[PDB]
Subunit: 114 residues, 4 copies
């Protein structure tokens, strides 16, 4: 139910080995850790969660763009890229968060399917 | 060797049934038709060409964004989105042209693999 | 030293009357208020800070994109758009759609 | 009536000294030269045309992104970036990376 895909606009490639941390807002309004992983050789991250565990909530997907660029020996601008959204409010959906990265820029979109 | 993927930034969905026309620059510097198709329910267009037919050249991928929006009953800004590139100059590659559409904006990236 | 500019990819316009709050990260890893305002008719927010106030540090720009889309009658995906960067003249530009946003930095 | 603005997503800067040629589509479906210039230090190209010259029609903005990247020593993917639209004040903005570009229209 939750997938992340990341592309690199400088190299013309998937963005491989990008760390992604997902948080869920708790009852007390703090962010609680929900899941994490890293993108594969295709720039995709599957397996973050399950239909059972991906309940309604406000979720934050934090893509570690900084470490990605630094590993390439590049000094990037942003600390991270985050996507924060309310999930499953009108019933279960599947969410793909797609991101396109450059050292001084990022773009994200969501693909939501029923 | 050539795939096109299109997403819709307004609906949060694949951009389905988008016409895509591919041209190749001929010897006389004119654009010649090379291949065409339309995106599927996943927003993807496979099958445009083959390894045999996708020789070196300068290619134009013209994504019919205008008809896409008009079909949704929306009046868009651009006539189309085009990506023009030299292909296969240092040997065969696989190319994915990924696009993200809004009525007054588009973004494209290339994923090139060996 | 810091300018925010917001554009609307649906309407092909500046994103006007967008609330923007800027925070600086404190030593305890909490976020100190720093600047705020609403984008103008040109989608720009100028006058956030001065050179003497704007010291090196990690800054967060929180753009209230949800209220923007709802005031236009459009259901938005995101709760907000928050842009976090280290300062080491900065323009933070954002291009908004209901299910997507893009941001770039122009540092001159 | 027509302005072009170009930004560089790699360097976090305006894209300076970018050649831009504007064409208007003729009745025979060929392309008549209309305006051209190079982006300034702010990445902007102003003064392309006047109100009386800028009539309704289909316009093509051809941005020489390949020469831009090569002058910086960077191998680019695209031959150029060409933006085609009907005019029915227009800013055509483009954000460049070596393998990607994004463009939006701001019509006010
Ligand atoms: N997330 C993104 N922000 N900007 C983009 N520009 C082009 C493509 C993607 C994208 C990724 C995967 C498939 C299709 C599109 C973009
Ligand atoms: N043309 C564009 N494509 N993608 C973009 N992403 C962020 C910002 C801009 C942009 C440019 C000028 C002002 C405000 C926004 C972008
Ligand atoms: Ca509910
Ligand atoms: Ca060759
Ligand atoms: Ca320092
Ligand atoms: Ca008319």
């Amino acid at each position: 139910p939750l997938m992340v895909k990341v592309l690199d606009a400088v190299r013309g490639s998937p963005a491989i080995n990008v760390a992604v941390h997902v948080f869920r807002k708790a009852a007390d309004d703090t962010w609680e850790p929900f899941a994490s992983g890293k993108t594969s050789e295709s720039g995709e991250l599957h397996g973050l969660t399950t239909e059972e565990e991906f309940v309604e909530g406000i979720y934050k997907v934090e893509i570690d763009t900084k470490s990605y660029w630094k590993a390439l020996g590049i000094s990037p601008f942003h600390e991270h890229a985050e996507v924060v959204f309310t999930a499953n409010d009108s019933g279960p959906r599947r969410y793909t968060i797609a991101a396109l990265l450059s050292p001084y820029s990022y773009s994200t979109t969501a693909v939501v399917t029923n």
